[PDB]
């Protein structure tokens, strides 16, 4: 599991831990919500610039 | 061994001043951010005495 844990840490800025679902961390949250904003102008913009 | 030379022996100390005094005595063993030299002063006021 070393190669996968190695790449997940860069993507999610967190070390995978058992009993916690792997979803992609804060990067997944930003990407999913930015995708919604691109589709429609009615979709909210909720991702900070920081 | 955590330390080559212990920062201080806990049994010898008695109050907060001995911890400071012992740390100054054993600071040569550690990797110091700033190696001490002669001290430079910028302010000095003498008060009137009895």
């Amino acid at each position: 599991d070393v190669p996968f844990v190695q790449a997940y840490s860069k993507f999610a800025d967190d070390n995978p831990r058992h009993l916690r679902v792997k979803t992609g961390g804060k990067m997944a949250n930003a990407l999913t919500n930015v995708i919604r904003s691109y589709y429609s102008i009615n979709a909210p913009a909720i991702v900070p610039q920081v | 061994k955590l330390f080559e030379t212990s920062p201080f022996d806990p049994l010898t100390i008695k109050n907060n001043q001995d911890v400071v005094d012992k740390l100054y005595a054993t600071q040569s063993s550690s990797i110091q951010e700033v190696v001490p030299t002669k001290t430079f002063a910028t302010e000095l006021q003498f008060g009137v005495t009895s």
Partner: protein
């Protein structure tokens, strides 16, 4: 990986005493390490010539 076999007697009538407590390093780690970091770093450098 696999372990090597013991003697036949030890596999039939053998008993061992073991303890299952791995423990944690947190009690030693959980502290203000600002003062003791320099002394620790000196020992860390000496481990490798």
């Amino acid at each position: 990986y696999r372990p090597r076999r013991f003697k036949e007697i030890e596999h039939t009538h053998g008993y061992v005493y073991r303890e299952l407590n791995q423990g944690s390093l947190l009690p030693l780690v959980d502290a203000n390490l600002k003062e003791s970091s320099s002394y620790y770093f000196k020992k860390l450098m000496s481990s490798i010539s």
